[PDB]
Amino acid sequence: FKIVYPNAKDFFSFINSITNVTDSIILNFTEDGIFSRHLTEDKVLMAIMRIPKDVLSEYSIDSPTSVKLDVSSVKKILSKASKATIELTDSGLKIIIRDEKSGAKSTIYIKNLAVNFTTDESVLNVIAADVTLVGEEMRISTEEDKIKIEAGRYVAFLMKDKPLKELSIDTSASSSYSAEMFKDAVKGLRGFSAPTMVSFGENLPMKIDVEAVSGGHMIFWIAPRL
Amino acid sequence: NIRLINMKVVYDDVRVLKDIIQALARLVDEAVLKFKQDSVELVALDRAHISLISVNLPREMFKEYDVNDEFKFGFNTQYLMKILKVAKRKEAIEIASESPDSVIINIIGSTNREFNVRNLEVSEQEIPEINLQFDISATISSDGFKSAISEVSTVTDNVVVEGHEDRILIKAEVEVEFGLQDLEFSKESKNSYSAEYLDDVLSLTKLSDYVKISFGNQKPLQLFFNMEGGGKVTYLLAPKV
Amino acid sequence: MKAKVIDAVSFSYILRTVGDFLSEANFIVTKEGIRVSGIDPSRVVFLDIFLPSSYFEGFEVSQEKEIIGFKLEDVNDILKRVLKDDTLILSSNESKLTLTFDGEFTRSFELPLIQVESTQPPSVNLEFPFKAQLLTITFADIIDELSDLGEVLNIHSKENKLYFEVIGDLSTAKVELSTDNGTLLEASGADVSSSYGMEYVANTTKMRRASDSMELYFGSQIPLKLRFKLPQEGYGDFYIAPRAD
Numbered sequence: 001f002k003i004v005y006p007n008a009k010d011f012f013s014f015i016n017s018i019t020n021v022t023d024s025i026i027l028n029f030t031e032d033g034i035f036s037r038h039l040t041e042d043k044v045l046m047a048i049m050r051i052p053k054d055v056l057s058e059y060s061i062d063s064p065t066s067v068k069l070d071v072s073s074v075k076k077i078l079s080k081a082s083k084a085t086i087e088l089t090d091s092g093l094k095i096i097i098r099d100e101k102s103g104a105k106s107t108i109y110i111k112n113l114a115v116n117f118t119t120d121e122s123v124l125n126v127i128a129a130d131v132t133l134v135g136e137e138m139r140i141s142t143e144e145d146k147i148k149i150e151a152g153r154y155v156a157f158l159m160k161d162k163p164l165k166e167l168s169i170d171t172s173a174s175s176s177y178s179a180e181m182f183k184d185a186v187k188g189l190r191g192f193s194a195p196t197m198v199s200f201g202e203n204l205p206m207k208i209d210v211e212a213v214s215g216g217h218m219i220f221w222i223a224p225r226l
Numbered sequence: 227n228i229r230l231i232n233m234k235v236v237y238d239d240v241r242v243l244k245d246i247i248q249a250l251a252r253l254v255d256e257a258v259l260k261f262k263q264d265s266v267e268l269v270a271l272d273r274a275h276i277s278l279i280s281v282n283l284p285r286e287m288f289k290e291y292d293v294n295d296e297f298k299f300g301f302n303t304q305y306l307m308k309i310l311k312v313a314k315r316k317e318a319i320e321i322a323s324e325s326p327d328s329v330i331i332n333i334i335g336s337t338n339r340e341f342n343v344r345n346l347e348v349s350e351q352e353i354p355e356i357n358l359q360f361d362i363s364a365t366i367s368s369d370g371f372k373s374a375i376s377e378v379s380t381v382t383d384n385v386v387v388e389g390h391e392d393r394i395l396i397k398a399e400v401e402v403e404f405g406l407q408d409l410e411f412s413k414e415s416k417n418s419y420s421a422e423y424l425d426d427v428l429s430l431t432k433l434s435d436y437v438k439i440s441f442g443n444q445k446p447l448q449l450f451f452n453m454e455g456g457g458k459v460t461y462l463l464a465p466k467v
Numbered sequence: 468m469k470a471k472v473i474d475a476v477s478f479s480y481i482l483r484t485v486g487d488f489l490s491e492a493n494f495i496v497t498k499e500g501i502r503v504s505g506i507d508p509s510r511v512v513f514l515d516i517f518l519p520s521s522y523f524e525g526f527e528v529s530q531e532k533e534i535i536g537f538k539l540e541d542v543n544d545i546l547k548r549v550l551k552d553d554t555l556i557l558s559s560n561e562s563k564l565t566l567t568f569d570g571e572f573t574r575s576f577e578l579p580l581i582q583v584e585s586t587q588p589p590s591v592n593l594e595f596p597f598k599a600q601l602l603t604i605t606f607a608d609i610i611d612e613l614s615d616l617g618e619v620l621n622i623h624s625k626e627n628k629l630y631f632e633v634i635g636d637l638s639t640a641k642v643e644l645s646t647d648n649g650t651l652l653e654a655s656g657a658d659v660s661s662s663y664g665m666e667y668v669a670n671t672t673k674m675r676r677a678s679d680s681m682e683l684y685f686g687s688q689i690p691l692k693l694r695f696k697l698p699q700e701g702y703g704d705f706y707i708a709p710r711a712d
Contacts, residue, residue, distance in 0.1 A: 073381055077400060080376035102370030103405025106377060123571065130548055130574060156574035163571045305638065312612045337642055337650050339612060344637040 001089050003034070004058035005051075006214040008084040008097050013191030015071055015078075017218050018047050020184055023072035030064040045181045047188060048219035055215030057085070069093060074108050081106055113199040113207060114173045115142060117158065118166035120196050121189035121210070128186040130154055131179045137225060138182055140200060141174035151179060165195055173202045176225035182206075185220035192218060233261060233297045233323040236290035236334075240313045245429040246281055246459065247310055251303035252426035253279060256348045261297040261321075271351050277423050278354055278462040287455035289318065299329055300346030312339050356462050361415045361442030362389035365408040368451070371439070372431040374402040379421040384466060387441050389415035394439060407436055415442045420466045427461050468496045468533055468559045471525035475555035475568065479546040480676035481516065481703060486539040487670035488512050488705075491583045496533040496559075500526075500701075505586045511708045512667050513589050521699040524554075535559055536583030542566075545576040591706065595684035595692060597624045597656035603681045603695060605650055607672035609642050614669040616640050619710065622685060623660035629683070633665075652680065659687040662710040671695070671705055678703065688712065 005011045018025050018036050028035040033053040039046045053059040074095060087096035095108040127149060131138045134152040141148045146159040147167070160167050185208050189196060192210045199207040208220040237243060246268075250257055253272040260267045268281040285291040299321065312333045313319060320332040326345060333339040374396040378385055386397040391411050396402045419441075430451055431437065438450035449461040472478045485492060488507040495502040500519040506512065520526045545566050549555070554569035559580075567575045609631060613620065617633040617640075624630070628645040644650040671693055674681075678695035685691045688709050695703040 073400075076380035077377045080380060081373060099370070099373070102367040102373060104367070104370045104374055105403040105405070106374070107401045107403070109400070126548075126550065126571070126574075130576075133544060133548065134576070153577040154575065156572060158572050308615060311615075314608075337609075337644060337648055339609075340641045340643075342639045342641070 001029075001062070002058060002060045003029075003088045004056060005086045006055075006057050008078065008086045009082065009191065010212040010214050010216070011086050012078050012082070013212065014049050014051075014216065014218060015075060016190065017188035018049055019071050019075070020047065020188060023075070024068065024070050026066055026068045028064075028066050029061050033059065040181075044178060044223040045184060046219075046221040047185075048221070049216065050219070051216035067093060069110050071110075074110060077106070077108055112201070113204060114169070114171040114201040115147075116166070116168040116197070116199045117147060117164050118195050118197050119158070119164055120194075121186065121192060123158070123163050124186045124189065124196060124198070124208075127156060128179070128183045130156065132183055136179045137176055138179050139174060139176045140206070142169050142172045166197075171201075173200060173204075175200050175203055175206065177206055177222050178225065181222050185222055188218065188220060228294070231292075231322050231324055232295060233321075234290060234292040235261060235266070235288055235321045236318055237287070237321075238289045238316070238318040239287075240310055240317065240319050242433060242453070242457070243319070244307075244310045244313075245432045247303065247307055248429045249427045249461075250279060251307050253277060254303060256300060256302055256346060258348050259299040259301070261293045261299065263293060263296070269353055271353055272423075272426075275354075276420075276464050277426070278356065279427070280356055280458075280460045280462075282458045284456040287457055290320075297323060297326075298345075299323075300348040301329075301343070302346065305343075309333070309341050309343075354462065356448070356460055358445060358448075360440035360445060360448065361413040362394075363408075363410040363438055363440045364389065364394040364404065364406060365436050365438045366394060366404045366406055368431040368434055368437045370404060371396075371437045371449075372428055374404075375421070375424050375428065377402060379425060383421045384418045385421050385424055386416065386418045387439070387447060389441060413442070415445075417441055417443060417445065417447070418466050419447045419463050423463050430459055430461060433457075433459055468529060468535075468557070469525075469527050470501070470523040470557045472522070472555045472557070473524045475549050475553040476551065477677040478555060479543075479549050480673050481697075482539070482543055482546055484671060484673045484703065485514060485516065486543045487673075488514055488667075489539055491536065491538050491581065493583050493585065494533075494535040494537070494557075496528055496535060497531065498528055504588060506589070507667075511664060513586075513591070513706045515588075515591070515704040515706075516702070517704075518697070518701050519699050522697065522701045529559075533559065535564055536581045537564060537578065538581055541578060545578065548574075548576070589706070593684075593689060593692075595656070595689060596659050596686040597629075597654075597684065599629050599644070599654040599683045600652045601644065601650060601681060601683065602652070603675050603678040605644070606681060606683070606693075607675040609644075610669055610672050613640060613642070614665055614672075618665050619662050620665045620668055621660070621662045622691065623658070624654075624656060625658050627654045627656070629654060657686075659685065659689075661685055661687055661689065661691065662712075663691050663707050664710070667707050668693075674703055685709075 034051040036049040084097050084099050092111040097106045131151040134154040139150040146157045149156040158164050194211050197209040203224050206222040210218050254270045257270045266283040271278050318334040322330045329343050331341040378398045382398040388395040394404045434451045434453050440448040447463045451459040489505045492503050492505050503516040550570050552570045556567040558565040564578045621632040631642045633640040674695040680696050682694040691707040693705045
């Protein structure tokens with residue numbers, strides 16, 4: 001074992017996202033890189049992280065494997081540790097963070113969607129908070145050249161350059177979603193300042209996707225309301 | 227020659243004082259700044275007698291320093307924090323006195339915020355010797371130290387400090403290995419110290435670039451902050467064991 | 468009615484301030500503008516906000532007098548959602564108040580109207596022996612700094628200088644404001660002294676986000692009147708009852 005991520009903060013952002021429901025997770029190390037998944041009990045919200053090996057400054061294993069670990073302590077340590085790299089290496093895993101400002105070396109031991117738009121976590125955070133004030137269910141839809149969001153009552157319209165960076169709608173669609181599942185997914189985009197892609201369709205899952213600045217994707221799938 | 231205002235000091239860096247007093251307020255309810263000819267001195271043993279802070283601020287650090295009579299300013303520490311907190315970015319503070327039973331504190335701005343305060347008498351305590359013979363002295367980053375204490379404290383109340391020739395390590399039994407600007411070695415050391423008490427003084431790390439850390443087997447932990455005017459803050463903490 | 472306030476953020480700080488005193492209120496809508504007045508549940512504070520037609524960057528009324536009853540938590544809940552640079556349209560009918568934000572994107576919040584009985588206003592046309600004018604920033608900074616020092620603010624005038632004091636058994640805090648040191652733009656009147664509840668006054672410092680200058684009026688055993696001047700001849704008046712001598 002030896003995995004070297006370029007930025008500790010991005011990996012900090014990843015660990016936090018895949019741990020909303022529980023502090024326990026399963027990291028998967030394969031030839032293609034790291035994969036991680038968590039799905040809520042009602043299976044309405046799926047959290048997915050994919051880190052391709054070519055994004056890592058170094059990657060090495062001896063055989064594709066999974067590790068199941070408790071991530072709670074490493075969460076709060078890194079919450080006080082903050083620019084640095086992060087290493088991972090009988091009873092479990094070992095994590096190395098090295099600050100090049102202070103010089104401190106810190107080691108932690110542990111045992112087909114029709115509609116498509118691109119924006120940021122800022123806008124999505126405004127929407128999630130707006131929706132939660134008025135109701136527990138969000139309806140998202142297409143109205144001509146803009147995107148309509150309805151809750152309660154609350155209505156919002158998103159269009160290109162107001163605020164959307166990208167909008168593509170090849171077929172009209174509407175879908176309803178749990179406001180709290182949307183809120184949780186949008187929360188999971190914290191630390192990722194990259195553009196955020198949202199996708200949906202007629203009564204189908206919503207996909208929320210973001211690449212980390214140094215590479216790797218944080219993905220959220222939300223089951224529709226039927 | 228004795229003037230109506232017989233003691234008057236002007237300090238133009240209230241953040242320093244604020245960082246000092248914030249740590250002091252965690253340790254004791256009342257304390258004494260003794261303004262002497264050459265420096266302002268403050269020594270305070272915490273309420274449980276488990277730790278000790280000692281402060282020396284040379285007169286050179288001040289914009290105006292007028293003291294012939296040594297002057298003992300006894301104060302409630304929470305209240306002085308509130309006073310110091312009135313100040314905005316790089317406003318000065320004046321501490322003055324016309325008679326031994328009162329102190330005038332002015333926060334200097336376009337209009338002054340004037341505090342007329344009763345001078346307190348504060349009982350004298352037996353004070354532990356601060357300069358013992360330690361087994362190791364390591365100078366490291368002050369930010370680094372603060373970060374290491376915070377990291378380790380989320381997981382334990384037992385801050386372990388391990389000294390070796392080339393390394394100081396700050397541990398939960400998580401390990402933070404120093405980065406090591408200077409080191410003085412006699413014997414390899416290991417001891418542990420309370421995170422609660424260390425948390426008390428994290429504002430002192432703001433006072434200097436580097437902290438001198440001294441400790442040893444069955445010896446207290448000393449923290450020494452040498453500041454840019456010749457000011458010195460020392461903190462002594464008994465082992466937790 | 469329909470009204471566009473361009474600086475939605477400042478408008479939200481006005482209504483935040485009103486929320487510190489009142490549970491419910493009425494926007495009283497006429498051709499000349501929007502009025503909000505009320506008395507706090509403890510009856511120590513009466514507030515009177517006037518927002519003239521010209522305060523609004525587009526203003527129209529569907530009747531002579533429209534009365535719009537609302538719960539302050541509900542409106543301030545929606546206003547907490549304002550973004551920096553947001554415009555705000557306030558739109559109304561028989562059942563509902565709509566609040567529309569414009570900026571990054573458009574978003575609207577619908578609020579059912581509630582019935583709110585009108586306040587019987589107190590004696591307001593008082594002869595204050597002392598009057599000052601000052602920058603609202605000056606006031607707000609000083610009050611913020613004194614607000615954690617005690618529960619009671621003493622105010623007294625001496626040969627046209629104005630003093631804010633917090634008195635304790637072992638400590639007094641004092642601030643001297645005067646035309647001389649530049650902190651008052653104007654000041655005139657008799658030497659008078661009164662005390663007021665600090666918290667009530669501390670609530671008003673928020674008005675710095677809506678007001679550049681203000682007027683302060685008081686006397687010995689007379690309500691403290693704070694008049695925050697708003698754009699376009701608007702004002703936020705707050706009257707705070709005096710404490711016992």
